[PDB]
Short mmCIF file of all heavy atoms in Angstrom, two decimals:
data_model
loop_
_atom_site.label_atom_id
_atom_site.label_comp_id
_atom_site.label_asym_id
_atom_site.label_seq_id
_atom_site.Cartn_x
_atom_site.Cartn_y
_atom_site.Cartn_z
N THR D 54 82.45 72.12 101.42
CA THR D 54 82.31 73.44 100.81
C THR D 54 81.86 74.44 101.98
O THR D 54 80.90 74.12 102.64
CB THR D 54 81.21 73.48 99.70
OG1 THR D 54 81.43 72.48 98.76
CG2 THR D 54 81.30 74.77 98.97
N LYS D 56 80.06 77.53 103.66
CA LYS D 56 78.75 78.10 103.42
C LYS D 56 78.55 79.23 104.39
O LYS D 56 79.16 79.27 105.47
CB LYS D 56 77.64 77.02 103.65
CG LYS D 56 77.82 75.75 102.83
CD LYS D 56 77.45 75.96 101.33
CE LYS D 56 77.75 74.77 100.51
NZ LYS D 56 77.41 75.00 99.09
N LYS D 58 77.11 80.09 100.47
CA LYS D 58 77.81 80.13 99.24
C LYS D 58 78.54 81.46 99.06
O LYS D 58 79.79 81.45 98.80
CB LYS D 58 76.87 79.87 98.08
CG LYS D 58 76.01 78.62 98.18
CD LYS D 58 75.06 78.43 96.94
CE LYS D 58 75.82 78.20 95.69
NZ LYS D 58 76.46 76.89 95.60
N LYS D 82 86.78 73.81 100.59
CA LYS D 82 86.79 74.41 99.25
C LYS D 82 85.95 75.68 99.09
O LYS D 82 84.97 75.87 99.84
CB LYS D 82 86.34 73.37 98.23
CG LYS D 82 84.83 73.04 98.20
CD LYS D 82 84.54 71.95 97.21
CE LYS D 82 84.39 72.46 95.80
NZ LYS D 82 83.33 73.58 95.71
N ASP D 84 83.17 77.64 97.28
CA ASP D 84 82.04 77.25 96.50
C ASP D 84 82.36 77.54 95.02
O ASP D 84 83.17 78.47 94.76
CB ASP D 84 80.75 77.98 96.85
CG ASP D 84 79.58 77.11 97.04
OD1 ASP D 84 79.38 76.12 96.25
OD2 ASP D 84 78.86 77.29 98.06
N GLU D 85 81.73 76.88 94.08
CA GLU D 85 81.96 77.11 92.68
C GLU D 85 81.86 78.54 92.22
O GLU D 85 82.58 78.99 91.36
CB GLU D 85 81.08 76.18 91.78
CG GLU D 85 79.61 76.57 91.73
CD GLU D 85 78.86 76.18 92.97
OE1 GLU D 85 79.12 75.16 93.62
OE2 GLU D 85 77.92 76.96 93.37
N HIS D 175 85.31 71.38 89.33
CA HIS D 175 83.91 71.46 89.52
C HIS D 175 83.15 71.44 88.25
O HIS D 175 83.60 72.12 87.25
CB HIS D 175 83.64 72.71 90.32
CG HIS D 175 82.24 72.79 90.93
ND1 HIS D 175 81.10 73.11 90.19
CD2 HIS D 175 81.78 72.47 92.14
CE1 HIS D 175 80.03 73.07 90.93
NE2 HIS D 175 80.42 72.65 92.16
N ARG D 176 82.05 70.74 88.21
CA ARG D 176 81.31 70.54 86.95
C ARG D 176 80.14 71.47 86.78
O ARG D 176 79.22 71.15 86.09
CB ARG D 176 80.92 69.11 86.73
CG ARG D 176 80.20 68.49 87.94
CD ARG D 176 79.66 67.11 87.71
NE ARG D 176 78.71 66.70 88.75
CZ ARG D 176 78.02 65.48 88.70
NH1 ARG D 176 78.18 64.67 87.70
NH2 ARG D 176 77.18 65.25 89.69
N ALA D 177 80.15 72.63 87.44
CA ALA D 177 79.08 73.65 87.29
C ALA D 177 78.62 73.76 85.84
O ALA D 177 79.47 73.84 84.91
CB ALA D 177 79.60 75.02 87.78
N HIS D 179 77.00 71.44 84.11
CA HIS D 179 76.86 70.14 83.46
C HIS D 179 75.40 69.73 83.21
O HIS D 179 75.07 69.15 82.21
CB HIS D 179 77.64 69.05 84.08
CG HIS D 179 76.97 68.52 85.38
ND1 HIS D 179 76.23 67.29 85.36
CD2 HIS D 179 76.83 68.96 86.63
CE1 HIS D 179 75.76 67.04 86.55
NE2 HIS D 179 76.16 68.08 87.33
N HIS D 208 83.88 66.09 90.22
CA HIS D 208 82.59 65.69 90.81
C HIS D 208 81.80 64.64 90.01
O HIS D 208 81.78 64.72 88.76
CB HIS D 208 81.70 66.91 91.05
CG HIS D 208 82.21 67.86 92.06
ND1 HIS D 208 81.44 68.26 93.15
CD2 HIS D 208 83.34 68.53 92.18
CE1 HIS D 208 82.12 69.13 93.87
NE2 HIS D 208 83.30 69.31 93.34
N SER D 209 81.32 63.63 90.67
CA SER D 209 80.70 62.44 90.08
C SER D 209 79.27 62.23 90.43
O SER D 209 78.60 61.32 89.90
CB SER D 209 81.53 61.25 90.52
OG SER D 209 81.41 61.15 91.94
N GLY D 210 78.72 63.02 91.40
CA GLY D 210 77.41 62.70 91.95
C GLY D 210 77.49 61.78 93.16
O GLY D 210 78.55 61.28 93.44
N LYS D 215 71.29 65.40 97.16
CA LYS D 215 70.24 66.28 96.70
C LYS D 215 70.20 66.42 95.14
O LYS D 215 69.25 66.96 94.59
CB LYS D 215 70.33 67.64 97.36
CG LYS D 215 71.54 68.50 96.89
CD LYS D 215 71.75 69.78 97.74
CE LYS D 215 72.98 70.54 97.24
NZ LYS D 215 73.46 71.61 98.21
N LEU D 216 71.26 66.03 94.45
CA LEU D 216 71.36 66.13 93.06
C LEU D 216 71.29 64.72 92.36
O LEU D 216 71.72 63.73 92.96
CB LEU D 216 72.67 66.88 92.65
CG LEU D 216 72.75 68.30 93.21
CD1 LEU D 216 74.06 68.49 93.97
CD2 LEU D 216 72.55 69.34 92.14
N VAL D 258 84.51 62.88 93.03
CA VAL D 258 84.05 63.61 94.22
C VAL D 258 82.62 63.50 94.41
O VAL D 258 81.82 64.00 93.54
CB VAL D 258 84.58 65.09 94.14
CG1 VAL D 258 84.08 65.87 95.34
CG2 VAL D 258 86.09 65.18 94.02
N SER D 260 79.43 64.79 96.31
CA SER D 260 79.08 66.06 97.01
C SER D 260 77.66 66.48 96.72
O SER D 260 77.12 66.28 95.64
CB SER D 260 80.07 67.18 96.45
OG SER D 260 79.83 68.38 97.13
N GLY D 261 77.06 67.04 97.73
CA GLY D 261 75.75 67.61 97.54
C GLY D 261 74.54 66.97 98.30
O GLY D 261 74.07 65.94 97.83
N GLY D 262 74.21 67.50 99.44
CA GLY D 262 73.10 67.00 100.27
C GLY D 262 73.41 65.62 100.91
O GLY D 262 72.49 64.84 101.06
N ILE D 263 74.61 65.43 101.25
CA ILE D 263 75.02 64.18 101.95
C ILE D 263 75.37 64.43 103.39
O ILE D 263 75.87 65.50 103.74
CB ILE D 263 76.12 63.36 101.27
CG1 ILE D 263 77.37 64.19 100.97
CG2 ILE D 263 75.54 62.71 99.91
CD1 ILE D 263 78.52 63.46 100.40
N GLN D 282 82.35 64.94 100.15
CA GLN D 282 82.30 66.31 100.62
C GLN D 282 80.97 66.64 101.29
O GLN D 282 79.93 66.38 100.80
CB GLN D 282 82.50 67.26 99.36
CG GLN D 282 83.87 67.25 98.87
CD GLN D 282 84.09 68.24 97.77
OE1 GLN D 282 83.19 68.93 97.26
NE2 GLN D 282 85.38 68.45 97.45
N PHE D 283 81.19 67.32 102.46
CA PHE D 283 80.08 67.62 103.37
C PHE D 283 80.13 69.10 103.74
O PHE D 283 80.77 69.53 104.67
CB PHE D 283 80.18 66.73 104.62
CG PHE D 283 80.10 65.28 104.37
CD1 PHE D 283 81.27 64.56 104.13
CD2 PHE D 283 78.90 64.58 104.38
CE1 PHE D 283 81.22 63.19 103.86
CE2 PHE D 283 78.81 63.20 104.16
CZ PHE D 283 79.94 62.53 103.87
N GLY D 284 79.37 69.93 102.97
CA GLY D 284 79.32 71.35 103.21
C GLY D 284 78.28 71.60 104.31
O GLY D 284 78.69 71.84 105.47
N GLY D 285 77.00 71.58 103.95
CA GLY D 285 75.96 71.64 104.96
C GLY D 285 76.11 70.60 106.06
O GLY D 285 75.78 70.83 107.20
N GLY D 286 76.58 69.45 105.64
CA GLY D 286 76.84 68.28 106.51
C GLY D 286 77.93 68.54 107.57
O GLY D 286 78.10 67.71 108.52
N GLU E 52 69.94 77.82 95.96
CA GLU E 52 71.12 77.05 95.60
C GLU E 52 71.89 77.65 94.44
O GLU E 52 72.92 77.16 93.95
CB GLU E 52 70.70 75.58 95.30
CG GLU E 52 70.15 74.88 96.55
CD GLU E 52 71.25 74.08 97.35
OE1 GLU E 52 72.43 74.15 96.89
OE2 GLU E 52 70.96 73.49 98.38
N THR E 57 72.22 76.37 101.20
CA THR E 57 72.38 74.89 100.98
C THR E 57 71.19 74.17 101.57
O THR E 57 70.24 74.80 102.09
CB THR E 57 73.79 74.40 101.36
OG1 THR E 57 73.94 73.05 100.92
CG2 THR E 57 74.03 74.49 102.89
N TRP E 58 71.28 72.85 101.62
CA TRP E 58 70.16 71.93 101.95
C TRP E 58 69.78 71.91 103.44
O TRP E 58 68.68 71.43 103.76
CB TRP E 58 70.51 70.52 101.44
CG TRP E 58 71.65 69.90 102.19
CD1 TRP E 58 72.97 70.04 101.94
CD2 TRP E 58 71.59 69.05 103.36
NE1 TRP E 58 73.72 69.36 102.86
CE2 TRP E 58 72.86 68.70 103.75
CE3 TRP E 58 70.44 68.53 104.11
CZ2 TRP E 58 73.14 67.91 104.84
CZ3 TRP E 58 70.73 67.72 105.22
CH2 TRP E 58 72.09 67.38 105.57
N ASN E 115 74.44 74.72 89.53
CA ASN E 115 74.01 73.46 90.11
C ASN E 115 72.55 73.12 90.02
O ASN E 115 72.16 71.97 90.02
CB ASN E 115 74.44 73.37 91.62
CG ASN E 115 75.93 73.43 91.79
OD1 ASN E 115 76.71 73.06 90.94
ND2 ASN E 115 76.34 73.97 92.96
O1 LIG F 503 77.04 74.14 95.88
C1 LIG F 503 76.73 73.03 96.31
O2 LIG F 503 75.52 72.65 96.41
C2 LIG F 503 77.86 72.15 96.78
O3 LIG F 503 78.86 73.04 97.33
C3 LIG F 503 77.49 71.13 97.86
O4 LIG F 503 77.05 71.85 99.02
P1 LIG F 503 76.50 70.97 100.25
O5 LIG F 503 77.63 70.05 100.71
O6 LIG F 503 76.10 71.87 101.36
O7 LIG F 503 75.38 70.15 99.75
C4 LIG F 503 78.50 71.43 95.56
O8 LIG F 503 79.04 72.37 94.64
C5 LIG F 503 77.52 70.48 94.81
O9 LIG F 503 77.54 69.18 95.37
C6 LIG F 503 77.86 70.32 93.37
O10 LIG F 503 77.07 69.26 92.80
P2 LIG F 503 77.71 68.13 91.93
O11 LIG F 503 78.82 67.46 92.70
O12 LIG F 503 76.71 67.06 91.53
O13 LIG F 503 78.33 68.73 90.66
#
Side-chain angles (χ1 to χ4, degrees):
Chain D
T54 310
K56 307 287 173 180
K58 305 181 65 71
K82 70 185 280 304
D84 229 319
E85 71 285 325
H175 194 277
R176 51 173 194 177
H179 80 100
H208 292 234
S209 61
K215 74 189 177 192
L216 300 127
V258 178
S260 182
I263 53 172
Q282 292 186 347
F283 300 89
Chain E
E52 294 270 359
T57 189
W58 67 275
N115 298 331

